[PDB]
Scaffold this active site. Sequence first.
Site, PDB file in Angstrom:
ATOM      1  N   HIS A  72      -4.724   2.999   0.523  1.00  0.00           N
ATOM      2  CA  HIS A  72      -5.089   1.550   1.515  1.00  0.00           C
ATOM      3  C   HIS A  72      -6.283   1.812   2.377  1.00  0.00           C
ATOM      4  O   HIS A  72      -7.146   1.069   2.854  1.00  0.00           O
ATOM      5  CB  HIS A  72      -4.067   1.112   2.040  1.00  0.00           C
ATOM      6  N   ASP A  96       1.488   4.278  -1.838  1.00  0.00           N
ATOM      7  CA  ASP A  96       0.187   4.525  -0.986  1.00  0.00           C
ATOM      8  C   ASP A  96      -0.476   5.941  -0.933  1.00  0.00           C
ATOM      9  O   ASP A  96      -0.142   6.646  -0.039  1.00  0.00           O
ATOM     10  CB  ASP A  96       0.285   3.900   0.422  1.00  0.00           C
ATOM     11  N   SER A 115      -3.912   6.343   9.688  1.00  0.00           N
ATOM     12  CA  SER A 115      -3.411   6.155   8.693  1.00  0.00           C
ATOM     13  C   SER A 115      -4.211   7.088   7.565  1.00  0.00           C
ATOM     14  O   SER A 115      -5.272   7.293   7.805  1.00  0.00           O
ATOM     15  CB  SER A 115      -3.477   4.610   7.889  1.00  0.00           C
TER      16      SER A 115
END
EC number: 3.4.21.5
Lengths: 10, 31, 251
Positions: free
Chosen positions: C43, C99, C197
């Site tokens: 992502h 992910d 992230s």
Amino acid sequence: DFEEIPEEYL
Amino acid sequence: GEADCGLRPLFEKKSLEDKTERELLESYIDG
Amino acid sequence: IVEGSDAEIGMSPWQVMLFRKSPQELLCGASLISDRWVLTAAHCLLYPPWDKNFTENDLLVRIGKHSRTRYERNIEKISMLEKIYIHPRYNWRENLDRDIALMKLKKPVAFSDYIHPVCLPDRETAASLLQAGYKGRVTGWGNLKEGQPSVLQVVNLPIVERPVCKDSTRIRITDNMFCAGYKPDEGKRGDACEGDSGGPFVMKSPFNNRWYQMGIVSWGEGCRDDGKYGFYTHVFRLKKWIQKVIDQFGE
Ligand SMILES: CSc1nnc(-c2ccc(Cl)cc2)[nH]1
């Protein structure tokens, strides 16, 4: 905000 | 994978421990 | 990282900063798994709901860093990307299932005191270490609150029981995710946050004293950092994809 990195990298 | 993986030059390679890795060891109550 | 501490020098030498060329900004964390492969969250590269779909040339990786903003002359190395590989079944439509993404560097980076790869777990390391209560460690340059750190931050968080993860959220949790964090009673806190992230959830094996990457910082709901938990990509479950890509497209 960030320090200018060497232009070779860009 | 990489033969040398996961061993840090400034820690494991010199047998120095970082300030909180022990907190990890202490939690591995193998269970 | 909320409620972390400043990392020590060389404490996380597989830490990579995903850097946008123009404008110059931190996109995400990432990790070095060999001299030309960098692991991150899909992502960080592809998220249509936000019109994110980076090509190789939009991005740099910065390796060996401590300071968030400074150019760390003589210490960090900045690499360009040869190729991005996104898991073919990464689910951006629903829940960020799978992910994970790999980035092949144009040239191999030189290892140093500050730059060094993390291990990927084997079935047996994963089985033994991925247990509720067992603490991993999360690092990144993301926000300190749901402002921004001078240096790389670190926090150790316990892996959480699967039912507790699920009961904390309305999102459907899959086997390719685990969650971590303290419970409200537990008196300690901490979480990843905005900018973190794609970074690594690592654990140090008590058997062979090597750091392994068990998770990738994937998503959370705020940073509640009461009753909420950070969700991580379960790296071993996707390791065959990782190996396929590397075997085929690595030299
Ligand atoms: C990208 S905005 C954001 N807010 N919270 C997060 C976050 C929190 C925890 C994890 Cl494990 C991942 C992302 N990201």
